[PDB]
Amino acid sequence: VSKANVPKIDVSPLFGDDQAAKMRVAQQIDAASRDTGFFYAVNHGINVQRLSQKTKEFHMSITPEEKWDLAIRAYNKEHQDQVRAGYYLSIPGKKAVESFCYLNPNFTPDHPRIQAKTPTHEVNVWPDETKHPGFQDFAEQYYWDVFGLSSALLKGYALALGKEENFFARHFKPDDTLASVVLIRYPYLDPYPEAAIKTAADGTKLSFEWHEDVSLITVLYQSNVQNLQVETAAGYQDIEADDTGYLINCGSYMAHLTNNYYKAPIHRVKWVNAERQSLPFFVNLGYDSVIDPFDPREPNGKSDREPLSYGDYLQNGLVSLINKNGQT
Numbered sequence: 001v002s003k004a005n006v007p008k009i010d011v012s013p014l015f016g017d018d019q020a021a022k023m024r025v026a027q028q029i030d031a032a033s034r035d036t037g038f039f040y041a042v043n044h045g046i047n048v049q050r051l052s053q054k055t056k057e058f059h060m061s062i063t064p065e066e067k068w069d070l071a072i073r074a075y076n077k078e079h080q081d082q083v084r085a086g087y088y089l090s091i092p093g094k095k096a097v098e099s100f101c102y103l104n105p106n107f108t109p110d111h112p113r114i115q116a117k118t119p120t121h122e123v124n125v126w127p128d129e130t131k132h133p134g135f136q137d138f139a140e141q142y143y144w145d146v147f148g149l150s151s152a153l154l155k156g157y158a159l160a161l162g163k164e165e166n167f168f169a170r171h172f173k174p175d176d177t178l179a180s181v182v183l184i185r186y187p188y189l190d191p192y193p194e195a196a197i198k199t200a201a202d203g204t205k206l207s208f209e210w211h212e213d214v215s216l217i218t219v220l221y222q223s224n225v226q227n228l229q230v231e232t233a234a235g236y237q238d239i240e241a242d243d244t245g246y247l248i249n250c251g252s253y254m255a256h257l258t259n260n261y262y263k264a265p266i267h268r269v270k271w272v273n274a275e276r277q278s279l280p281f282f283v284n285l286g287y288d289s290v291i292d293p294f295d296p297r298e299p300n301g302k303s304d305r306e307p308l309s310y311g312d313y314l315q316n317g318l319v320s321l322i323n324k325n326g327q328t
């Protein structure tokens, strides 16, 4: 398989006030978005080594009892309110992956959307503080660090599409974003059960099948173990690993809003027998956020798509992804 073109882009100007330098970053985002759909954000300012260390400490110390106590409803019928947030268990002999998902720390018991029991909004669940000292505080702070990077990236995408820098960012707010962090553990297993390995039509062994992301953009940290592939006009291509940067791509809400000018790249996860991490941040807007679809390839910029609220998009997309590629 040939190597995919995934450029490294220094996104540091997006945190500053040099408008010309921001346009030069926006062009790089435009170019990558129009080519393979992927780029590595470098000079992003986040301490990813500490994120990996704290995540490993958690994954390797959590016990079976704690996983049931934090489990989503797909694994524990007693937790009917946990559709998104909580622990997603492995099934030894059958399913290797396991993970922990958390949402906006501002979704507290008194938040208006939590009081209304609005779909896709939940109060996070956390392990015992005595058993995992500092974990909740670290994880909540990580949400806000990656939120800050994501806001800066959204400024770059807006400028790239010919809009004002707050075009997307104005709908991405601390008090109501539906964004999520997922701490995914992909384990080393000896023997690796065949039931946990899928095979693509082209013969490639996979851990997760082809898909488009359910997001506006996805901001991903991964270990230094090659595993991702992107479908291009030249076929599936390997994405090189880089554990110092963030791998960025568009999700299907960006494809909808831009009329496929910036596509949501189809990508898949190869099977690798290695202990590693996949830590995505899905950049989701607010429940009622609606951006009128447009088309940057058309002179009048008009699109033939109907407006879709982010809440409707997200609820439907997450269900569809489970139906297509299985409960994770």
Ligand SMILES: CSC[C@@H](NC(=O)[C@H](CS)NC(=O)CCC[C@H]([NH3+])C(=O)O)C(=O)O
Residues within 6 Å of the ligand: 083, 084, 085, 101, 179, 180, 182, 184, 208, 211, 212, 213, 214, 228, 267, 268, 269, 278, 280, 282, 318, 321, 328
């Ligand atoms: C390289 S794909 C990256 C990663 N796979 C995932 O993260 C998959 C596909 S993006 N996403 C999902 O299952 C949606 C989770 C949504 C979350 N539960 C929520 O409530 O927000 C991986 O396997 O490495």
Ligand SMILES: [Fe+3]
Residues within 6 Å of the ligand: 211, 212, 213, 267
């Ligand atoms: Fe994905």
